[PDB]
């Protein structure tokens, strides 16, 4: 309720708004490449717990949504810490990445519906195993980068509304300080 406060709060939230908007678009571009890359990887996909998420947060309930269906391999930095591979989600998952994962050896992952929706011989077995690792992996970042895009959209809009509301409060306080300061001067002058 001080002009001093309000100005600080306003400074941070204007930058948050700017960040979350850039992050929104970074994810929008990554979801773009990921949804198109999902086509030759879904029909391809048609033919111990594995937890598939990633390293990065701020994507709503991606990481916690699999960690709940979890309770043992955890692919993604975030899955090990909330409950085993680092540096995922950031760069799009190659079939090569899926092989690096299977070499170290139910599968739980997020399956992409839309931008807004998601739900949680011995030479032949190795290729069909890596075919699942890859499939879960391609499905996952589509769901993560969609979610992060959406969540960062919401945070940006929420910051924007809070900015509007704090600016209003700022000006109301600003006007009252002038008026109160003046009324003090007048009352003193008048009392003489």
């Amino acid at each position: 309720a001080t002009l001093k406060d309000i100005t600080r709060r306003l400074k941070s939230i204007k930058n948050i708004q700017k960040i979350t908007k850039s992050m929104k678009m970074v994810a929008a571009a990554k979801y773009a490449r990921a949804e198109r890359e999902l086509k030759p990887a879904r029909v391809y996909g048609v033919g111990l717990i594995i937890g598939v998420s990633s390293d990065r947060g701020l994507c709503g309930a991606i990481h916690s949504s699999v960690a709940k269906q979890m309770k043992i391999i955890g692919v993604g930095d975030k899955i090990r810490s909330i409950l085993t591979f680092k540096e995922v989600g950031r760069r799009p998952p190659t079939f090569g990445d899926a092989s690096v994962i299977a070499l170290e050896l139910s599968i739980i992952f997020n399956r992409f519906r839309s931008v807004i929706s998601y739900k949680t011989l011995r030479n032949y077995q190795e290729y069909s195993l890596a075919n699942i690792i890859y499939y879960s992996l391609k499905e996952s970042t589509t769901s993560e980068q969609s979610a992060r895009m959406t969540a960062m959209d919401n945070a940006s809009k929420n910051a924007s509304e809070m900015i509007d509301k704090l600016t209003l409060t700022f000006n109301r306080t600003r006007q009252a300080v002038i008026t109160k300061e003046l009324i003090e001067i007048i009352s003193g002058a008048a009392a003489l």
Binding site: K18, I19, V26
Partner: protein
């Protein structure tokens, strides 16, 4: 009062000062209404380019410490911008 009376203002800021921007001139807010009419041709040339490149920098300056996967075009704005600064 003095802001409306004058032809322009050089705005200094504490925060620019401690960040190392000395002199601490807010180049986005500062204005001279005379502008170009008071610049030599040689300054006018390069200053015009600097102004634009700094304005375009300011738009993006918060993606600086939160920018891993920015397009090369905007890494260029960031870079030209910190350098001109």
């Amino acid at each position: 009062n003095v802001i409306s009376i004058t032809d322009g203002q050089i705005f200094l800021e504490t925060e620019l000062f401690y960040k190392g921007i000395r002199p601490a001139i807010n180049v986005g807010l500062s204005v001279s209404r005379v502008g170009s009419a008071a610049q030599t041709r040689a300054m006018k040339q390069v200053a015009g380019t600097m102004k634009l490149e700094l304005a375009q920098y300011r738009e993006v300056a918060a993606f600086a410490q939160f920018g891993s996967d920015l397009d090369a075009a905007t890494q260029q704005l960031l870079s030209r911008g910190v350098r001109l600064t």
